[PDB]
Design a protein around this ligand. Sequence first.
Ligand SMILES: CC(C)c1cccc(CNC[C@@H](O)[C@H](Cc2ccccc2)NC(=O)[C@@H]2CCC[C@H](C(C)(C)N3CCCCC3=O)C2)c1
Length: 377
Amino acid sequence: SFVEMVDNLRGKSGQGYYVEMTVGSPPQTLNILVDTGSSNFAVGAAPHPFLHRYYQRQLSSTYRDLRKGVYVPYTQGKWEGELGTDLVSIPHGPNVTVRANIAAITESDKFFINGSNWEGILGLAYAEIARPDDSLEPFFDSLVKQTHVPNLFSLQLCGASVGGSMIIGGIDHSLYTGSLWYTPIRREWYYEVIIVRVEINGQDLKMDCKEYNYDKSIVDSGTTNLRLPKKVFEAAVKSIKAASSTEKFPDGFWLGEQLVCWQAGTTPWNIFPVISLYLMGEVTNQSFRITILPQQYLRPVEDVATSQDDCYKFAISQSSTGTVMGAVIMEGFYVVFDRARKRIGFAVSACHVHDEFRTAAVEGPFVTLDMEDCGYN
Ligand SMILES: CC(C)c1cccc(CNC[C@@H](O)[C@H](Cc2ccccc2)NC(=O)[C@@H]2CCC[C@H](C(C)(C)N3CCCCC3=O)C2)c1
């Protein structure tokens, strides 16, 4: 019955992926961004210039006020509002209704996006990072507690205006090819994983692997970019610059600020390297790699110019809070958040990114000694 959830996600490039949900009685329909990088379910509940619609608690007979405030500061953007509970369903999801915590957003700053078609966010990570504290049960925990939906979900995020699937409660085998490779969830707060090796065009970055996970590494569907700790970011940009020095790039391109364009169909993909991320595996001394194409880390953006060229922004950003495997890493992979078994699986997606002579891959097994030394603490 997972077929009912295939293609249940939509979005705009750089702006997240959202699924349709209803809250309250009678049901109020809202588009909700799916975010494995946080743990609060929150919806616009007051007018805002960028909201097409919002949750009206007054109109729901099943609304309950928790008489408690809340706020969430993300890496960029924040909101504040009022806690309460209500009945929640996912029309293209399992056939259930659950009473869940909901933060009614009453003020926000740089959270909602102009012209955006989503009105709220579904934090799919664990209670440990829920605001105001870990006693506010996250939506997925309520779903599993109140129904027989199995304790896992999977995400197929597709590039090119974007779509994909969130399969709630399982794995749909028609959405990926090849084998699923699993990496442990190190700790249940973020979806934290451990990266044990990095290569660019087959060349090892050769850093202390602790640097790759300083101070954590997470899988985060609510962040567009690959974000890398300062030292890793610099090494990676240096290597990518070198590989592509054939061409010249504007100022701020490598900062993700300025875009670069080529005549339509002439993007020199070949001079941009693949990036391989090796992840800790399920058995001793064993890892696997996912290989990322430049078509993933050069994000397509519309040309505000009179030209109809292919333009892109560099979708790798420097971080001061650890590695973030964002949407452009997840795109073209099928990612299984197996909460029940505390692991995350990766396989080549059915909607994989295409390149003339290279392909995104998930490959294993590899041997990697002393993998536990890669985790930060
Ligand atoms: C809440 C706690 C646990 C917390 C605190 C700090 C970091 C984290 C790690 N997860 C972050 C996500 O939950 C959050 C999700 C988000 C969605 C929509 C708007 C804003 C944030 N995303 C971000 O903060 C990102 C930082 C880089 C710029 C990102 C921008 C380009 C802006 N962005 C917004 C729309 C979705 C795609 C996107 O890329 C947002 C978690």
